[PDB]
Amino acid sequence: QDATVYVGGLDEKVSEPLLWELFLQAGPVVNTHMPKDRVTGQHQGYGFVEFLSEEDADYAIKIMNMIKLYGKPIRVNKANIFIGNLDPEIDEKLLYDTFSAFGVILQTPKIMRDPDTGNSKGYAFINFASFDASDAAIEAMNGQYLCNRPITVSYAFKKD
Amino acid sequence: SAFDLDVVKLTAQFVARNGRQFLTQLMQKEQRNYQFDFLRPQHSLFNYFTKLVEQYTKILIPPKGLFSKLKKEAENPREVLDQVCYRVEWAKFQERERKKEEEEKEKERVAYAQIDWHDFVVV
Amino acid sequence: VEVKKFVKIGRPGYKVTKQRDSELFQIDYPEIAEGIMPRHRFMSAYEQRIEPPDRRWQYLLMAAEPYETIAFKVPSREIDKAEGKFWTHWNRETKQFFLQ
Numbered sequence: 001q002d003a004t005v006y007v008g009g010l011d012e013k014v015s016e017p018l019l020w021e022l023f024l025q026a027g028p029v030v031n032t033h034m035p036k037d038r039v040t041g042q043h044q045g046y047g048f049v050e051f052l053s054e055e056d057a058d059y060a061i062k063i064m065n066m067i068k069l070y071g072k073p074i075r076v077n078k079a080n081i082f083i084g085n086l087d088p089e090i091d092e093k094l095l096y097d098t099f100s101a102f103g104v105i106l107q108t109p110k111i112m113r114d115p116d117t118g119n120s121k122g123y124a125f126i127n128f129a130s131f132d133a134s135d136a137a138i139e140a141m142n143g144q145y146l147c148n149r150p151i152t153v154s155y156a157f158k159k160d
Numbered sequence: 161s162a163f164d165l166d167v168v169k170l171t172a173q174f175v176a177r178n179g180r181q182f183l184t185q186l187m188q189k190e191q192r193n194y195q196f197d198f199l200r201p202q203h204s205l206f207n208y209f210t211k212l213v214e215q216y217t218k219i220l221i222p223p224k225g226l227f228s229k230l231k232k233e234a235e236n237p238r239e240v241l242d243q244v245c246y247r248v249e250w251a252k253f254q255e256r257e258r259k260k261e262e263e264e265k266e267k268e269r270v271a272y273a274q275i276d277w278h279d280f281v282v283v
Numbered sequence: 284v285e286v287k288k289f290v291k292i293g294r295p296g297y298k299v300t301k302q303r304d305s306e307l308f309q310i311d312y313p314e315i316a317e318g319i320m321p322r323h324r325f326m327s328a329y330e331q332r333i334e335p336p337d338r339r340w341q342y343l344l345m346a347a348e349p350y351e352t353i354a355f356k357v358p359s360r361e362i363d364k365a366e367g368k369f370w371t372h373w374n375r376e377t378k379q380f381f382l383q
Contacts, residue, residue, distance in 0.1 A: 103368075130262075131269035132368050139325070139365075160284075264318060272322040272367075274287040275346045278330060280354040282342075283299065 004050040005057040006079035006119035008088030009149075010043060011070035023049050023076075026063050027056020035116055045072070046088075046117050048079060065089055066147055073148040077119050080156035081126045081134055086111070087149040088120035099126055102141055103133020125156065168198055168205065172212035176220060294351040301355065307383035312350055320373045321347035323382050325357070325365040345380065 007019060020032040034047040051057050061076040066089035068074075075089035090098070095109050106129050112121040128134045134155070142153035171186055178184035186199060198205045222228055232239040298311040312321065323345040328338035343365050346352035363383065364370055371382045 102366075130265050130368075131273075132265070132366070135269075135272075136366050267318070268320060268322070270286060271319045271348065272324075274284075275290070275322070275348075276287075276292075276352070277324065277326055277344065277346070278332065279294075279352055280326075280331070280342060280344055281297075281351060282354055282356060283297065 001079045003052065003054050003057055004048050004079045005060050005076040006046065006048050006117050007064075007074055007076050008046045008120045009069070009073040009075055010045045010047060011072040012042070013070035014043075014072070014074070016047075019047060019049055022069070023051075023060050023064070026060035028052045029056075029060075044114075045122075046114060046119060048117060049076070068148055079117065079119060081128060081137055082154050082156045083124045083126060084152045084154070085122065085149055086120075086124055086151050087147045089147055095124065095126065099128075099137070099141075102136045104129040164198075164205070167196075168209050168212060171196065171198065172209060172216045175213055176216035290348055292351070293349075295349075297350060297353040299353050299355070304383065307381065308355065310345055310353060310380040310382075312347060312378055312380055314378055315347060315349050317348065319348055321345055321350070321380055322367055323365060323371060328356075343382075345382065 005023075010019070016032045016034045019034075020029045023029040023032075029049045029051045031050045032047065033050070034043045036042060037044055049057075049060070051060070057076075057078070061078060064074065064076045066073060066075050066087070073087040073089055075087070077088070086095075092109055092111060095111070096105055099105055099109065106127050109124065109126040111124040113119060114121050128137065137153045138155065141151070144151065174185040186196065190196060190199060197203060198209050200206065218224060220226065223230060233243075295313075299308055300311075301308045310321075323343060325341055325343045328340050328342060331338065340356050340358055342354045342356045344352045344354035365382075371380075373380050
């Protein structure tokens with residue numbers, strides 16, 4: 001897990017030897033793994049590249065971070081408001097700093113991860129201090145231009 | 161982080177003995193080729209340096225132990241218990257004020273989510 | 284549902300005064316005798332009672348419980364912020380509402 005780098009944000013043009021060919025300049029990528037879905041039978045955008053040394057994986061994570069690969073925000077990492085279609089290049093501290101401009105955050109946010117890879121699932125949950133920050137996130141942040149990924153902010157629970 | 165904290169404590173001790181706002185022992189040190197990034201207010205350590213300077217100024221008070229001796233806080237446990245009870249009452253009043261502010265914010269959020277947003281009038 | 288049905292609507296005439304600042308509108312409202320502050324919100328012109336053509340702008344509307352909502356159209360994309368807790372104020376002593 002230390003020598004392997006988890007890549008997120010892969011489109012349909014990216015393939016299993018294509019990621020190994022793109023990561024060959026960063027370091028000696030020994031193997032590439034792409035988990036296939038059960039309903040569609042294709043990649044879900046997240047994969048893994050197992051290299052030989054941990055320094056090559058660190059250089060690939062520091063070089064290929066927030067890159068625009070196949071029209072997709074590909075990024076390598078070390079393997080009541082709901083935000084969907086978020087970029088995997090952002091972290092919890094980056095999401096807390098991005099959410100601090102609209103309103104005040106009550107605590108540190110959390111992002112959902114896949115049970116197989118564990119880098120990024122695609123959705124996240126963040127809680128605001130009051131309902132005014134949630135309304136400002138649903139008015140402004142729900143549709144704002146993020147890092148090559150259109151996010152969507154919505155209410156997790158609402159009572160009619 | 162011990163050397164930076166010691167430098168901040170030395171700057172707070174040297175700046176508290178000044179007779180003016182700008183005529184201090186640290187303003188002339190900035191022009192004497194001494195790098196001090198904690199003097200600018202843009203850094204996060206400046207908020208702690210200001211609190212250290214405030215504590216150094218409060219350590220120079222006449223009831224702080226320079227020319228007088230405290231008798232109520234040092235020789236009366238009942239006065240300390242009354243001060244602790246007053247601090248607990250102030251904390252309870254602050255918690256009640258925060259709960260009232262949260263209730264007012266919830267009432268404003270309930271009133272804003274129930275008003276009609278289709279009756280537009282441009283005058 | 285209970286607060287929306289019990290809200291009285293007589294629709295009085297509001298008094299708004301705009302001023303181009305550089306670094307802000309002042310709405311004169313009567314005494315409401317309540318703790319509910321008037322709230323401002325920016326919406327689109329796609330939803331209307333009659334749906335007129337060529338509606339592709341935004342409108343910032345301020346609304347209160349005893350008074351009617353006053354709306355101002357903004358042709359620009361983003362020149363200010365329509366947040367309530369950021370750049371708005373409501374003095375209950377003089378009953379003056381300001382938003383910048």
